[PDB]
Each structure stands twice: as C-alpha cells, then as structure tokens.
Amino acid sequence: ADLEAVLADVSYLMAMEKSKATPAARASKKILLPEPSIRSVMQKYLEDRGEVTFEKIFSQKLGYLLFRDFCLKHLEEAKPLVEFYEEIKKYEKLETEEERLVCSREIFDTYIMKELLACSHPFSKSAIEHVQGHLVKKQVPPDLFQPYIEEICQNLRGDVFQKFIESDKFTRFCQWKNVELNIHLTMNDFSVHRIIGRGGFGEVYGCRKADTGKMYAMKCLDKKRIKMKQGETLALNERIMLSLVSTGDCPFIVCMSYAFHTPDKLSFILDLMNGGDLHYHLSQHGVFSEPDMIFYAAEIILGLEHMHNRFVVYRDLKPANILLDEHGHVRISDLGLACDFSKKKPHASVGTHGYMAPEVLQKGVAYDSSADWFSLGCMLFKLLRGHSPFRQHKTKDKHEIDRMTLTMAVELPDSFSPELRSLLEGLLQRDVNRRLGCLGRGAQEVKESPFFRDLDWQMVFLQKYPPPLIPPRGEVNAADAFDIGSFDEEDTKGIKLLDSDQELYRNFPLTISERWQQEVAETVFDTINAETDRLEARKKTKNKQLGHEEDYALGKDCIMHGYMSKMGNPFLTQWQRRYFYLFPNRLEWRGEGEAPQSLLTMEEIQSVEETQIKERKCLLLKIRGGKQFVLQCDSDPELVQWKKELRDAYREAQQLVQ
C-alpha cells in the first residue's frame, strides 16, 4: 500500500490502542461543569418532571456513583447499608456455586451474623429467615439476598436520601445532569479516522470522541443523496429503530449513543466493532465448522430475540452485517432496513437476494418476524458452505436465485450433522406456519432445538464461551480505503436542499442518557470531579478572603436564581452576563456581586416568549408601556425552566391582582 494509506492505518490503530490502561488520558478536550449555583435551576427542572425520586437517581450511573460516594464518606449511618448492597451486587455476578458458597458465607458473617449477635440488625425477620433457610440447605442461588436488596433500598429511601439531596454531592449530580442535557454535537467534537465501510446513503468512519476519548463508529448519511433517492423516511426509520433497540443492555446489537446532523450529513454514533465484519473474516479464514458456527448461531439468535421482543424485524441478515468485537464476540450492526411489525405487518420485498424469506420475496403478502428465521438459516448455511443455499451472484442471475420460491433447500448430508440437518430443515421451511421460530414462542422454538442441546444459554448471554476466531490485533480488519472508495460527488449535482427539507430533520438529533452516562463513568468521571472540586475550593477561598460570597441566603422568598445574559445592547457589551433572582412579585438583578438591585416587577410584564437572536435561543420579555428585555441562558434546561417559571410567576401575580 502507499505511504498515505499506511500512515492513516497506523494513526487509526495507535489512537485505538492509546493509553488503554488510563482511559482518562485519551481525552483531548475537557468537560467544563457549570458553577455549583446551577442546582437552584436544575433542582426545579428535575422536580417539575419527578426525576429527583430515589429510584430515578439511584438507577442512573452517575447518580448512583455520587450517592454511593456520599454514603461511604459523608454519612456514617448509611455506610454499612451501601457496603452491604454493593457486596450483594458483587455476589450476584459470581458464576459458580463453588465460589458463591464462600462468598455467601463471608457476606452472611460480615453483614448479618455479627449484627444479629450485637442485636444491631435493623432488617426484618423474614429476610433473615429466608437467607438462613437457603444457606442451611447449602443452596446459593444468585437471588439469595434479594429481600435484603429490597430492604436496603427501603432504608436508603428514608432520611438518607433527603440528606443526600441536601448535600453538596446532589449539587454535583445537578451539574453533571446539566452537562448531559446540554449536549449539542457537531462534526468538530469527533476525530474522524479512516473510512472503514460504505453503502446505503453514506459511509462509516472510525472516530474518537474528543472530550472523553472513547472510540466510536460514525455512520454518516448524505442529505443530498437521501433527497435524491427519496430516502428521508428510511433515514428517520433507522434512527427510530436505533433508539428503540439501543435502550437496554443487550450485548448482541450495535447500540447507538448519539445522533446529530450537520447542514449536509446525518450522523449516528455507534459501538466500534474493531474486529471487522464476519464476511471478511469468512473470506480470509474459509468455511467454518459446526462447533465454530454454534457460537455465532447462538449469539445471533439471542440478538434476534432481543430485537423481536421489541417487535422489530431485521430484514437484512447477512454474514456481512455481523461484526466481530475485539475479543471475537459478534453483534448485529446494520438496522437500515429493519422495520416494526407491531402496528402493521410489512409487505415490501426488502432484503438481499439469497437471504430473503419466501413471503418477503412474494409480492403483496404481509410478513412478520418470521422473515428473520429464514434469513438466519440462509446465513448459517453460508458460514458452512461459503454461499447461500441458492445459487450465488457469480453462479446465477439475481432472478434465478429468486427461484428459492419454487424449490426446497438442498440440505447436504455430507457437511452437516443430523441435528444441523434438522435445524436447517426447520429454518428453511417454505411454509411460514410450519417454519421453525414462526410458531409458538418464537425464539424459544429455536433455542431449544437439538443443535443447541449441549449449549447453556445463560453462559451465552454472559459471553463466557471462547470465540472460534479472534481478529488480529495489528490490522484494521477492513478493506483498503482505496477499495472502499467513495460516492460520485457529481451524482448530487442539481440537488438543492430547501428549508422545507431541512425541516424533516428538525427533531433528528438525539442523545441516550444511559449510554452517555456509562461513557463518562468509564472515562473521565473521577478526573473531572477532582478538577471541579479543586476549582470550587479555589473560588470558595477567594470569596471568603475577598468577601462577596456566592449568595447571601438567597433572599427570603426567592423562587429561583441563576446566571443570565442581559442581551441586545448595541452601545454596551452584547453579552452582559449577570446574576438574577426571581420573586413572586419582582425579578431582581445583581452586578459583579456587591449588591443586588431590582430590574423588573412581575406586575409590569405583558408577555414572555422565546426568540432566536444571532442563531442562539433567547428569552424575550415584553413590558407594559413598550419596554422589553432579552435574556439568554446557557443550557436549554435553564432556558426551559426560566421560561416556565417566569410565565407562571407573572401569570399568577396578575391573576391574583385581577
């Protein structure tokens, strides 16, 4: 290969491998948390939608981390409870009874027996007796301590949670949540490496997120090409499907973290399966063997089960769409042609010739998730033979392959064991009502098939089995960027994107909370937290020494307060950032911090409405008498809450004054 390609590959590989032992060091940009005063607005914003309950926070990764570290360091009473809960959770992940026996005895002695002996145990007799009855019989199921989990959560829900909310670590949670809700991604935020694939409406590049360093796969769709091929509906459907299946914990599907668009591209951020697709590895390694294909079939069956449980039908199932991760475990990747059959069963012949179900290939006849099982059979057949059960592209014409609707699968006796012959005979049935997986419970009908009789599906979900193939660690595991190529830019000439077209993607951008929180927790949570803490320590010392504290008790009846930019003065600085206080009768206004002063009285307000200025969202207040004020906030949540609270305040004040 030429020098440029070699350099691109080396840069991509080094960025992928850099600082594996210290993920925090991979970030080139830094997350700047807002000031601790943010909680005055963010608390109301979260309360107004009921998000400050114990379950909501404790179920969030960052919320859980902050609550845990508060209990373990700033509340002695809650320390044993959190320690017990955490060790129970650790125990639940033990995979063998030989280890669970000792772990459970240690947990019992440490957190139950000693407290019982000291008579300090606060838990109910029921949980004690349940655990004692299970253990006296030598039973160590993973659900041993579930009653203790419930009771620990009940105890933490009490004054412990209120103390946490009143603490300075709920302020940190508010800061992190505000940082989350203000995610506005652009192509600048990512360091895009060499192209790794192409197809559909655009290309796929490996990329590193700037402010966390986590490696992602950026899938870009060109808006002009989408308009040219009338693909707006498909482009939006792909986002719907990705957001539908990403919300969860399934490790068998390429999950989406973010979605955004530039003026000309639609971009999805997905998991990076640096091992490459299974078709490339099949070509390099050759036909797999039955014990090897057991692994792939089991993993793909679990993935399809996850998708089907959500009523999504994966119409294009090929070896090319199956991506191997670093360690060799597979995932389903391309949800471009996926559809939902819960509302109405599709009827379009969408797929790839040689892997489409007979009812999919038939015109007009509706079909359901039943399609994915025929495609699974065809795919498993390819892994063992190098081609679909019906002729390949180089062996027959496209419509000659379509004669799959007028024949029956060969079902070779040589390369297949009788169990596999039965499995493929079930999966390649012409009649949907008789086809395996298309009757009864669905995924269970296949999972219980004889070919998987030896397989323990719990270990499949836990991914304990050794992959048959481990992708090379020193290669990109993809075709050369010259081979992948690029779309012809001339094809888009004559295509113009109207404002009515950019309106189709008004609501496109998206961020998934759990995925972002997990990324932050893995990468830069502790570093940022420490830096933030140092910054507030510095500023607190400065304020204490020089006076002008952060706030003088926040007044007597302040509804809310926070920074806002008094905007729009031509003869002064446009961004006159200041600190504001809201009261039921007036809105006060403070300078650098010496003394607050009144800016406005609610009785004067005529209306409050949002407006766009300098391509930035702002708040417009119109005043009885022709006066007006413009205020600009920093995070959409600040703007939303300020709008809501100002509106409610003046409406109530004027209605009462009526």
Swiss-Prot record:
The keyword Phosphoprotein applies. GO terms for cellular component: cell projection; cytoplasm; cytoplasmic side of mitochondrial outer membrane; cytosol; membrane; plasma membrane; postsynapse; presynapse. This is Beta-adrenergic receptor kinase 1. The active site is at D316. Interacts with the heterodimer formed by GNB1 and GNG2. Interacts with GIT1. Interacts with, and phosphorylates chemokine-stimulated CCR5. Interacts with ARRB1. Interacts with LPAR1 and LPAR2. Interacts with RALA in response to LPAR1 activation. ADRBK1 and RALA mutually inhibit each other's binding to LPAR1. Interacts with ADRB2. Residues 557-651 form the PH domain. The PH domain binds anionic phospholipids and helps recruiting ADRBK1 from the cytoplasm to plasma membrane close to activated receptors. It mediates binding to G protein beta and gamma subunits, competing with G-alpha subunits and other G-betagamma effectors. Residues 1-189 are annotated as: N-terminal.
